């Protein structure tokens, strides 16, 4: 079996990657975001969806998960989806301001407000991507995310979550949280993933040095040939 990480382990691994291996944040974010866009294209391919091109709403939170989200939006566009982004709390750092410009000049729109009703999200967006919080989340969700999650709970279209379903406790999960249909675990799954019950669980972020994966006993599966995602069972 593949190993499921504690928050401690995840922080240890991610820190190892940036200090010991000296990957820069935008290198891994680029790969992670591409992994997601690809997981999404394998689970919900365009041709298999009613709208042409198919519409996606990507909701990006205030840290790196949200960053993954912007990369993901951008690769989705190139793969033939029509994404829209909602990005309410934007850190003022070059990485993020660059990512925002990139999507903008690719004619990906940033909504000014979340559609206030589940029904409206449903009529406009055939898939929704949860790029709000990731593994370093803790404590009560504060605004505007409390009420964003609340809308999400009511949706009838599928949710795809990046790394962790936002709102779940990173290890123990959340019985009344959002229940996504696709979960892309980056690098390795996290212990909350044991509580996952959607249809699709993909593993992404094919950048793990063998030496890091051996040190932490990750038991990563073999990604087939040149693929950057793997479906778990």
Ligand X SMILES: NC(=O)c1ccc[n+]([C@@H]2O[C@H](COP(=O)([O-])OP(=O)(O)OC[C@H]3O[C@@H](n4cnc5c(N)ncnc54)[C@H](OP(=O)(O)O)[C@@H]3O)[C@@H](O)[C@H]2O)c1
- Report how far residue 24's alpha carbon sits from residue 17's, in angstroms, rounded to the nearest whole number: 9
Residue 143 or 225 having the CB closest to ligand X: 143
What is the total count of residues that contact ligand X (CB under 6 A)? 22
159 binds ligand X (CB under 6 A): no
Which residues are paired to 186 by β-bridges? 204
DSSP 3-state of 155:
coil
Residue 134 partner contact from ligand X, its own copies, none using kind-dependent CB cut-offs of 5 to 8 Å? ligand X
Strand order in the sheet with 182-186: 82-86, 55-60, 127-131, 159-162, 182-186, 200-204, 230-231
The binding site for (6S)-NADPHX comprises: 64-68, 134-140, 163
Positions that interact with its own copies (CB under 8 A): 20-24, 26-27, 30-31, 37-38, 41-42, 45, 78-79, 94-95, 97-98, 101-102, 105-107, 206-207, 209-211, 223, 225-226
Pair of tokens at residue 45: 């391919």
68 binds ligand X (CB under 6 A): yes
Which residues are paired to 201 by β-bridges? 183
65 binds ligand X (CB under 6 A): yes
9 binds ligand X (CB under 6 A): no
Q: Determine the straight-line distance between the first and last CA of the chain, rounded to whole angstroms.
A: 10
186 binds ligand X (CB under 6 A): yes
Interface stretch with ligand X, choices 80-88, 103-111, 137-145, 175-183 (CB under 6 A): 137-145
- Report how far residue 66's alpha carbon sits from residue 96's, in angstroms, rounded to the nearest whole number: 9
Residue 105 or 142 having the CB closest to ligand X: 142
Residue 51 or 214 having the CB closest to its own copies: 214
Residue 140 or 225 having the CB closest to ligand X: 140
Helices (H) and strands (E) in the chain, counts: 7, 7
Residue 129: name the closest of 196, 61, 176, 191 by CA.
61
| CB distance 167 to 178 below 8 Å | yes
The binding site comprises: 64-68, 130, 134-140, 163, 166
35 binds ligand X (CB under 6 A): no
Residue 139 partner contact from its own copies, ligand X, none using kind-dependent CB cut-offs of 5 to 8 Å? ligand X
Residue 3 partner contact from ligand X, its own copies, none using kind-dependent CB cut-offs of 5 to 8 Å? none
- Report how far residue 147's alpha carbon sits from residue 152's, in angstroms, rounded to the nearest whole number: 9
The binding site for K(+) comprises: 65, 130, 166
| 193 to 46, 109, 161: CA distances (angstroms) | 27, 31, 11
Q: Applying CB under 6 A, which residues contact ligand X?
A: 32, 61-66, 68, 89, 133-142, 145, 163, 186
């Amino acid at each position: 079996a593949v190993k499921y990480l504690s928050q401690e382990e995840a922080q240890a691994v991610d820190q190892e990657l940036f200090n010991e291996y000296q990957f820069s944040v935008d290198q891994l974010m680029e790969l992670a975001g591409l992994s997601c866009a690809t997981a999404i294209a394998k689970a919900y391919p365009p041709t298999s969806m009613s709208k042409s091109p198919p519409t996606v709403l990507v909701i990006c939170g205030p840290g790196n998960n949200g960053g993954d989200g912007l990369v993901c939006a951008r690769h989705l566009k190139l793969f033939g989806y029509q994404p829209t982004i909602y990005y309410p709390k934007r850190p003022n750092k070059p990485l993020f301001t660059g990512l925002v410009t990139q999507c903008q000049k690719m004619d990906i729109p940033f909504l000014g407000e979340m559609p206030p009703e589940p029904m409206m999200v449903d009529e406009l967006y055939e898939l929704v991507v949860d790029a709000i919080f990731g593994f370093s989340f803790k404590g009560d969700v504060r605004e505007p995310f409390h009420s964003i999650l609340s809308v999400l709970s009511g949706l009838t279209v599928p949710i795809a979550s990046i790394d962790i379903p936002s709102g779940w406790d990173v290890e123990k999960g959340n019985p009344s949280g959002i229940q996504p249909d696709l979960l892309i675990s980056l690098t390795a799954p996290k212990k909350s993933a044991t509580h996952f019950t959607g249809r699709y669980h993909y593993l992404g972020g094919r950048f793990v040095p063998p030496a890091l994966e051996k040190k932490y006993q990750l038991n990563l599966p073999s990604y087939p040939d040149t693929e950057c995602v793997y479906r778990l069972q």
